[PDB]
Amino acid sequence: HHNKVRTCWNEGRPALAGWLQLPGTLHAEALARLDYDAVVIDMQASPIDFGQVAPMLIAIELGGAEPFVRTQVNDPSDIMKLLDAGAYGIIAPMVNTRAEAQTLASALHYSPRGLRSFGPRRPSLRYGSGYLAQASETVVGLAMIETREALANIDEILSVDGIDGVFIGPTDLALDLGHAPLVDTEEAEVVSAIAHVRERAHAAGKRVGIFCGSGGFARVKLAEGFDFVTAAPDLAMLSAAARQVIADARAL
Amino acid sequence: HNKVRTCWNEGRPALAGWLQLPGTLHAEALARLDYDAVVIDMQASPIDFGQVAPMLIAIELGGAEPFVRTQVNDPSDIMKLLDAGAYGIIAPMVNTRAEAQTLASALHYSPRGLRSFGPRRPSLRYGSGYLAQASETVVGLAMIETREALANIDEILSVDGIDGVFIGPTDLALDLGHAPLVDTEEAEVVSAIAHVRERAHAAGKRVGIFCGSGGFARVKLAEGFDFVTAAPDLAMLSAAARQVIADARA
Amino acid sequence: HHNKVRTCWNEGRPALAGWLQLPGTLHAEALARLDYDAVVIDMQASPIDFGQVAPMLIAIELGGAEPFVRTQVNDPSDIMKLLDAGAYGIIAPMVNTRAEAQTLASALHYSPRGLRSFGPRRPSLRYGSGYLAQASETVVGLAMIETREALANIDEILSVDGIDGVFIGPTDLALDLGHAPLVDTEEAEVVSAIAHVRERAHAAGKRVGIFCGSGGFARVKLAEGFDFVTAAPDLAMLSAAARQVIADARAL
Amino acid sequence: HNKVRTCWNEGRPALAGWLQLPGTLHAEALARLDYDAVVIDMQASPIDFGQVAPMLIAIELGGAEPFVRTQVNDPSDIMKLLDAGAYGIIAPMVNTRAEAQTLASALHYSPRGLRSFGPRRPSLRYGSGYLAQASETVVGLAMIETREALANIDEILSVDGIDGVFIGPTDLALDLGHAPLVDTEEAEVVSAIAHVRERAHAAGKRVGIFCGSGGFARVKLAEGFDFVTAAPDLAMLSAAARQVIADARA
Amino acid sequence: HNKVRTCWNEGRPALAGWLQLPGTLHAEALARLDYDAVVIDMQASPIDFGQVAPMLIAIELGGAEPFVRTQVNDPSDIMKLLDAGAYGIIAPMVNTRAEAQTLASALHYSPRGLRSFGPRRPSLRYGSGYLAQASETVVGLAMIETREALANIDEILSVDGIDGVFIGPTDLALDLGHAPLVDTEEAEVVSAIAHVRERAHAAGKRVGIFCGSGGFARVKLAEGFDFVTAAPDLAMLSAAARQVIADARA
Amino acid sequence: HHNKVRTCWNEGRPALAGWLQLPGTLHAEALARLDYDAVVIDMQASPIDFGQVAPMLIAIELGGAEPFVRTQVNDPSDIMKLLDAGAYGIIAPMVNTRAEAQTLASALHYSPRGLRSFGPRRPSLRYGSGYLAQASETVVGLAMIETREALANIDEILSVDGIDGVFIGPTDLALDLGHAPLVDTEEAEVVSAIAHVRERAHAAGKRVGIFCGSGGFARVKLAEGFDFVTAAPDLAMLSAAARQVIADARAL
Ligand SMILES: [Br-]
Ligand SMILES: [Br-]
Ligand SMILES: [Br-]
Ligand SMILES: [Br-]
Ligand SMILES: [Br-]
Ligand SMILES: [Br-]
Ligand SMILES: [Br-]
Ligand SMILES: [Br-]
Ligand SMILES: [Br-]
Ligand SMILES: [Br-]
Ligand SMILES: [Br-]
Ligand SMILES: [Br-]
Ligand SMILES: [Br-]
Ligand SMILES: [Br-]
Ligand SMILES: [Br-]
Ligand SMILES: [Br-]
Ligand SMILES: [Br-]
Ligand SMILES: [Br-]
Ligand SMILES: [K+]
Ligand SMILES: [K+]
Ligand SMILES: [K+]
Ligand SMILES: [K+]
Ligand SMILES: [K+]
Ligand SMILES: [K+]
Ligand SMILES: [K+]
Ligand SMILES: [Mg+2]
Ligand SMILES: [Mg+2]
Ligand SMILES: [Mg+2]
Ligand SMILES: [Mg+2]
Ligand SMILES: [Mg+2]
Ligand SMILES: [Mg+2]
C-alpha cells in the first residue's frame, strides 16, 4: 500500500527505474525483481500497444517494482485508461507549455480537481478500501522536457500544482537543439540546458528525472541529485550483451 | 540456402542465439549480429505457436537461419513449424532409435518421410522447385538430455534423416544425478558430452550443444562442436540489467 | 436488418443493455443471448483495445443483441473505425459542449452531412445492398453527460441534429459535482441534475440513457422513463456472484 | 509456499475458483476473494497457452494459488505450464495406473520423474534453491471422470508422485449413463463420488471435486473433500446477468 | 441444423471454402457467399487455437457451417474445437481402422464415444436439449492422403461414428510417387480418387475432396462428391493480385 | 538501402502498391513478393490495430516491397510510432488545410526540422550506420485529399516543403462532393476535381497518388501520369475471387 518511488522521495532518496521497449511478461517480472524501484514501459519508442502493456503492468507489480508508463502522447483518455490498468507512474512526452502540463495534471487526479473519470479496476484491488482517500499519492506524474520550447517554458511547466515534476530526454533535447542524437550526450549546450532544468525543478520544490542509456551515465545523474533515473532500455542491454557473448565465443 | 548448412559445407561451425522471450524486435536485432542461426525455444518459455510465426520472419529478415527447439518430438507440431519457415528443428527428449525415426519422419516428404505437403512460407523463399531440395533446406537435430539417450546414442545416430544430435547439458547433468548448472565442470557430465561428440563425429553426423556463456561457447567451438548456442536472451538481459544497476548504484 | 434499440424506440419502449469490461467472445455471446436489446463494450474503463473489441462485436451480433461501444474518447477516427468493425451504437465520453456534440455527430453520418469516410466492411455484410440508403438509421449515437460543464450546456448539446440524445454517468457526474463516487448514487444534488438532464432531453425530442450498477437501480430508471438503461458491468456481476458462492460454501 | 499445501498441512480443505473466460481482470478479482486457489480450465474453454500465461501472474498477484486443468494428460504440455508458474495441475481423463504414472512423470525432476529443467517463473518465485523443494511447490491431481477410472481407482491412487484425484462428476454421471447435471442427486453418481473419496482417504491421498454452487460446495467440504471448486466464472456471470435482467424488467 | 447435413438430407452436395489466413473479416465475407461450409485449415497454415475461435463465430454469423481441418487426429484437440463451435471436423492422416476409431471416439459422447462434456458454444446454439442431438450437429470426415489409407479404405469406412472420408489429393499424389499438384490429371491419382469415392458410396458413407479451382470442383460435384472445397483463400488472393498487377502494368 | 517507391520516382517511373485490410503476415509476405513496389496497410478502413501492423511491416519488407501505412488519423505520435516499427511510407487521412499538412510534415522529419522523436529501432537495423544522414530520403509522406475543403486548399497543402505530395481517395471525395460512393467512380464532377488535384501537384513539383479498386482503373491512372497507384484491397480481390470460383463450381 505505497508507491515505491514516492517512498524513495519521502525518505529523501532517488528512485532508479528500468525501461522496457520489448513486449512480454517474462522479462518484465525478471527485471522488476532486481534492485529497481520502478520499471517504465515505453509505449512511444516501441511496438508495445495497449493489449500487451496490460499484463506487463501485472508482471512488474508481482516482481516488486512500481509499474510506470511513458505514454505515446500526452492524451488524457490514454493516461486514464493506463491508470485504471494499474500504471502508478506516467511520463507524458512533448510537454512544451504550461497548458500541456495542465492537460497531464487533469488526467492524473480525480474529478473535480482533475477530470480522472472513476473506474479504478486494478488500483482498488491493490490499495483496497483505503484507495480513494490516498489515490493522488498512489500515482507519480512527470512532464517530459525534450524541446527548445519546453526548455524556454520550464518555469511555467513547473508552476502546475498536480504534476510531481519533469523528465528529461537528453537525446531528444540534443536533437531539437540542433546537435547529434548521441546516447547519453555530453554536448556542452545540452549539458547546460539539462543543468538549468534540474536547477529550476529543485527551485520550484518539484522532482526532476532523466533517461540514461547506461549504468555509468545513471551513476553521474544520481550524483548530480536527479530524483528519478532510468537505466537502461531492455533492447539496448540485450543487444550489447549478445554482441559481447558472440565476440567472446568467436575470439582467438 | 540454409546458412547453417552453408557453414558446414564450407567447413566451419555455426554459432546460434537462443530466445525464450516472445516478440519480433529482439529476434531481428540478435539475428542481425554475427549469429549464423537464432533458436526460438518453445519448451522452456511462454512462446506459443501464434508468437513464433512472426519471430521466424524477423530472424530471416535480420539475416540468420530461423531454428526452433520444439516443446516436444511430435511430427504434426514439427510440420506446422516447417510450413511457417522454421529451417532448423531441435527436438527435445529423443531417447531411442524409434523416437529419432519419429523426428526423421517429420522432416522429409514421402518416400523419405511422411511430411504433409503444404509449404506456405518455404515455397515463397525457395519457389516452385522447393520439393526437389526440401530435405536440404532444413537441419534436424535430436536432443540428447537423458541417461537413456546417452545409452542409445549409436542407435539414435544410425537414423538416416537426422543431421545429428544437440546436447542439453543441464537436463543431462540433472539426469546423471548432478547439479543442473549450465557450462558445468562436473567430470562425469564433461566426459558424457565428449563421448556424445566423438560418437556423432564417428557416425559422420553433426553435434551441437547449449551454452550459457561466450567463454564456454569458445571452448566448445575449439573442441569441434558443429552447432553452438550462446546464450538465452532472458539470461543475458537479466545479467546485463544486474550489471547496469550495480554501475548506477555504485 | 434493424437496430434492436431503434426498434424499441420506434415501438415507444426503452432498451436494456449489457456492459462489458472483460475482453473475450464467450461471455459476450452468452450475455447477448439473454433478454438484453444491446450489449455495450466499455473501451474507456477497461483493458479492452481495438484488437479484442473486433471479435466481441461479432459475438454480440451472433448472440442476437445490438453491439454498442463506449469509446475511450470522443475522437471521430476511433468512432468511424468501430462503426466499420460493426458497432451499431456509440457512447462518446466527456461531451461537455455543443461543439464536442457536433464532433460526435460528424463521425456517425456519411459525408457530406457527417464526414463518415466510406468503407463499411461489416455493416454492408449485415444490411446487404440496402445499407447505404438507411445507414444513419442503423447507428445510435449518445453524448455522455458526466461533468458540471455538460450539465450547464445540456440544451446546446441536445440542439445537435445528428445525435440520438445523451447518456448519463451518475458516478462520474457525482464526482465532478464534488460528491462521493457511489455506485448508483442517490446524492440529492446528483439526483436533481440527472432529473434535469432527462427533462431537457425529452423536452428536445431526444433520447436519454443512464449507466446502472444493479438491476434494482435500472428498474427505477426504466420506471422514470429513461430510453436506454445499462445494467450491470460483467466484472461487477461476476465479482458479486463469486463472493456469494464463497460465503455459501464457507457458511456454518 | 503452495497455499493449497499450506491449507492441507494446517488441517483444512482448499476452496478454489474455476475460470473458463480468458483474461487477467476477473482472474485477479476472483483470486483476491476468499479462494485458496483459482483453476484455469484449458479444456472446456477457449483458453490457449498465450492467454493462460498472464492469467497465472494475475492469480498469483491477487493472492490465490494458480492451478490449471489441462486440455489433456500430456507431459510436455504440463511441464510448459509448470515453467509458466502453474503450481497445481488437474489432468483430465486419467483412467489407468499407466496414465497416472504419465502424470506423475511430468510433475517431478529426475530421478523421481522426467520433468525437463527450465523453471522460468518458479525460479523467480522460489529462487536458486527451487530444485530441492520443487516437488512440494506443485499439487498434482488425476481427474476421475469415467467408469474405467472408477474401476481402476486403487491402482491410480497407488502411484507415488500424485497428491490424489479430482472428481469430474458431470462427465462421470454421463459415463455411468445418467444426466450430465452438475451437483447431481442421482443415487449411483453420489455413491460413486463417496466411494472415490473413501478410497482416496484410505490410501492417504487427497480428493477434490468440481461443484456448480456454493450450497453443494458446503456439503462437499462437510463430507471431507480436500479441494473443492465453486463455481465456473461463465456459469456465475450468466446466472448473475439473468437475475439483473429479471430485477430490471420487473 | 448443421447446414451440410441439411444439404445431404435434401439430396445435394455441399460446396465449402478453405481458409489458411487467420482473422474474422474474410471468414465472414466468404461465409456470406454461396458456400454451405467454410473449412479453417489449422494444419497447412499459421492458424493456432486463439485465432480459430473468433473465426468460427464469424463463419456462423456469415451463414455457413464452420468446419476445421485439424493439425492432427488428436481427440483432446478435436473436443476443444467442438466446444468452440466447430460443427465439422476433417482429421488429417487417418491411415488405419484404429486411427478412424480414435476420430470417431472424439466426435460422440459416451456411450458412443468418450467426448468430454463441456459444450460452451454448442449449448448456446442448440440450448439444453443439445446432448440428445449432439452427434447429428457435427460432421466427421477421415482424411485419405496416403497409400496406407488407400490400402485400408474399407476398414476405415467400416467405423460407425464417422460420416465418411475427405481426399487430400496433393498429399495422396505425392505419396503415390507423383507431382504434388492440386486438381491433377495423373492417371493413377485420378483412378485412386475414383476408387475411394466408389468404396465410400458402396459403404453408405460420404466422400469429400479438396480442389484448387472452380472448374475442377464442378467436375467433382458432377462425379457425385458429397463435400467439395474450392479454393484456399491464400491461393485465390495470390492469383487475384497477380491478375490485378498484370491489368495495371498492361 | 533504398525506398523502392523513391527509386521509381528518381527513375521517373510510377510506383504500384498493394492495399491490405486483412490482418496477418502470410498474405502480406505473399503479395509483397509479387510485382508491387510497395504494400499499404490500411489502419483506417479495417480492424488492423498497432499489435497486428508491427509483424505485417516485417513480412512486407522480407517479401521485397516497401511497407506503407494509411494511418487511422493524421496524428504525429501515431505516425512516429509506425515509422519506428519500420513504416517507410505514410498516407495520412483527412488533410484538409496547410496546417494539417504541416502537422503531417512535422511527424516525418527529425528534430529540429520535424519533431520526429529519435528512436529508430527497425530503420537503424535496415539502413545500418548510414540511416540518420539519409533518414528523410528513407520515408515517403502523402497527404490524403478526400474532401471539398482539401480540394479548395490543394495549393496551400502542396506548398508544405516536407510532404512528397498528395493521395486521392476518389470514393471518399465523390461522397463529400454529394455523389454516389462508387468504387473507381467516373462521376464527371469528381473526375474534374481529381484531374485538378493531379495538375496542381505536378505544377508544384510534387507527387500525386490515387486509390484504385481494380487493375483496370489503376492502368488508366498510370496512363494519366499518377506517381503512386494502389490496386486493389486484399478483401475486395479475395471476395471477388471466391465469388468467381463458386460460380464456376456451381455452373451447369
Ligand atoms: Br539487482
Ligand atoms: Br532521450
Ligand atoms: Br556481432
Ligand atoms: Br534404441
Ligand atoms: Br539443457
Ligand atoms: Br543459461
Ligand atoms: Br434473460
Ligand atoms: Br457512472
Ligand atoms: Br470473499
Ligand atoms: Br490400471
Ligand atoms: Br465434470
Ligand atoms: Br457448472
Ligand atoms: Br456467391
Ligand atoms: Br486397418
Ligand atoms: Br491435399
Ligand atoms: Br490449391
Ligand atoms: Br506479379
Ligand atoms: Br477512396
Ligand atoms: K492488440
Ligand atoms: K524491485
Ligand atoms: K547474422
Ligand atoms: K438478446
Ligand atoms: K485469496
Ligand atoms: K453461405
Ligand atoms: K515486390
Ligand atoms: Mg467517464
Ligand atoms: Mg495433408
Ligand atoms: Mg477516408
Ligand atoms: Mg530439456
Ligand atoms: Mg472432463
Ligand atoms: Mg520523444
Residue numbers in the entry:
A (entry chain BBB), C (entry chain BBB), F (entry chain BBB): 0 to 251
B (entry chain AAA), D (entry chain AAA), E (entry chain AAA): 1 to 250
Describing publication, verbatim:
Here structural analysis of hydroxyketoacid aldolase from Sphingomonas wittichii RW1 (SwHKA) revealed a dynamic movement of the metal cofactor between two coordination spheres without protein scaffold rearrangements. Holo‐SwHKA forms a trimer of homodimers, in which each monomer adopts an (α/β)8 triosephosphate isomerase (TIM) barrel fold. In total, holo‐SwHKA contains six equivalent active sites; each of which is formed from amino acids from two different domain‐swapped dimers. The transition from M2+ R to M2+ A,S is induced by bidentate substrate binding and occurs without a concomitant rearrangement of the protein scaffold.
To gain insight into the earlier observed activation of the enzyme by phosphate and a possible interaction thereof with the metal, phosphate was included into the crystallisation and soaking studies. Neither was the case for SwHKA. Docking studies did however reveal a potential docking site, close to H44. The docking does however support the earlier proposed function in the pyruvate deprotonation, studied by H/D exchange. In both cases 100–300 fold improved deprotonation rates were observed. This could be enabled by a phosphate in concert with H44.
